[PDB]
């Protein structure tokens, strides 16, 4: 089976250039069309361009023509996307996609997708979050995970034992260029005296691993 | 450039119901080179249909594609729980390939008014010189809701950010959280902090509030 594996997430400064790689295995590399598609946070898919490795024939979307380069190397079955003069608007998950087959007849449409590469264009530095309690019929309580970079953070409750009624919100990007995230849970009011509620926050890039007890 | 229009951008449907998703092109799509993709949160898109009507091996036959020229349709004969997702059409009949903006198929359920909660800044944060006030809108349907911050009855602007959860997999509701951020010094200038909430399920706006340091 055809498998596409992309390089890992990267933070890039404004004005810089990024190279994303996509290594293929399990099929014929040279005679099938390889494209790049990106998806900005909360937005739809956008076709950027493609390459046919054997023929060294590229095809770029007009709005990226002059700012991107797509190349292929059959010695490693790897395709590369270069995107230059990066702006905040270029923050997106970048996918490589190969056309499907009926070593069979190609279909043009993208049957095979990489796992995606998050490219974040920012001047921000790595920073661990502070974790603040949102202190509490039904009661609500939670944790505010404030001022971290880059994405992502993960939050659980009571070491994963509590999932019912838990809502963990999408991160928001603050004017500072740092992210903030909230996680909440609703519980019986009567349980507030008898049960302990702890939010477990993990931010791998800063090695921030905090277990915050939320009290009335 | 061929513009693909997917309208409406959201369809609210019940499990088991038929779904028909339209994709209209601004000009004829060459050789019916029209594809449909499904995408779930946290996942790459997945090819469902190519060449307007052809289905890859492994894709369920409850998905079918039809149409030609400028008018294309994805039909889901009977919606399974996993079929509630975002669907994109794509044309590749010209060298410049384009996607439609996508259509989210979401679960229709009964109207639920938000339960509103407001949270003062923690003592821990206040010690650091910053104040975040949080307003939670919990378990509501439909997704459209509005939150306005009022500080001593003054309508706030530009100092709050909000986000919304994906539709809950169990009760098909949404939740929304808004955060108001001020310096500690500015926070201490005011007494009443309030969030005001509007929603289809509410006949009139709901306000939750607290008085600072009480």
């Amino acid at each position: 089976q055809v498998q596409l594996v992309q390089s890992g997430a990267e933070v890039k400064r404004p004005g810089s250039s990024v190279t994303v790689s996509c290594k293929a295995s399990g099929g014929s590399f040279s005679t099938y069309a390889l494209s790049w598609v990106r998806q900005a946070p909360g937005r739809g898919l956008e076709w950027m361009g493609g390459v046919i490795p054997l023929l060294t024939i590229t095809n770029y979307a007009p709005r990226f023509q002059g700012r991107i380069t797509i190349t292929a190397d059959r010695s490693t079955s790897t395709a590369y996307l270069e995107l230059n003069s990066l702006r905040p608007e270029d923050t997106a998950v970048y996918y490589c996609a190969r056309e499907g087959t009926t070593l069979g007849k190609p279909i043009g449409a993208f049957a095979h997708w990489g796992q995606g590469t998050l490219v974040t264009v920012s001047s921000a530095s790595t920073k661990g979050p502070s974790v603040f309690p949102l202190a509490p019929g039904t009661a609500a309580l939670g944790c505010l995970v404030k001022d971290y970079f880059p994405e992502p953070v993960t939050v659980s409750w009571n070491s994963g034992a509590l999932t019912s009624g838990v809502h963990t919100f999408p991160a928001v990007l603050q004017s500072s260029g740092l992210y903030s995230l909230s996680s909440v849970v609703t519980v019986p009011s009567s349980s507030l005296g008898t049960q302990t509620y702890i939010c477990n926050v993990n931010h791998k890039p800063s090695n921030t691993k905090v277990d915050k007890k939320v009290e009335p | 450039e061929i513009v693909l229009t997917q309208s409406p951008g959201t369809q609210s449907l019940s499990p088991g119901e038929r779904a028909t998703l339209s994709c209209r092109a601004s000009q004829s799509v060459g050789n019916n080179k029209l594809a449909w993709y499904q995408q779930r949160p946290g996942q790459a898109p997945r090819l469902l249909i190519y060449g307007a009507s052809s289905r890859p091996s492994g894709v369920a036959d409850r998905f079918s594609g039809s149409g030609s020229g400028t008018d294309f349709t994805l039909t889901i004969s009977r919606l399974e729980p996993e079929d509630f997702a975002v669907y994109y059409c794509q044309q590749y009949g010209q060298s410049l390939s384009t996607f439609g903006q996508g259509t989210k198929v979401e679960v229709k359920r009964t109207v639920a008014a938000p339960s509103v909660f407001i949270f003062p800044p923690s003592d821990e944060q206040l010690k650091s010189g910053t104040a975040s006030v949080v307003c939670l809108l919990n378990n509501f349907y439909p997704r459209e809701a509005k939150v306005q911050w009022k500080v001593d009855n003054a309508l706030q602007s530009g100092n709050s950010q909000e986000s919304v959860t994906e539709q809950d997999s169990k009760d098909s509701t949404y939740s929304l959280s808004s955060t108001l951020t001020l310096s500690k010094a500015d926070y201490e200038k005011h007494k009443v902090y309030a969030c005001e909430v509007t929603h289809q399920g509410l006949s009139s706006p709901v306000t939750k509030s607290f008085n600072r340091g009480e």
């Binding site: 190609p106 043009g108 | 080179k33 590749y92």
Partner: peptide, 15 residues
């Protein structure tokens, strides 16, 4: 159409 090229290539590499 650039998206038709690999189909052509597949055909001529059979014959």
């Amino acid at each position: 159409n650039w998206f038709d090229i690999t189909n052509w290539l597949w055909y001529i590499k059979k014959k």
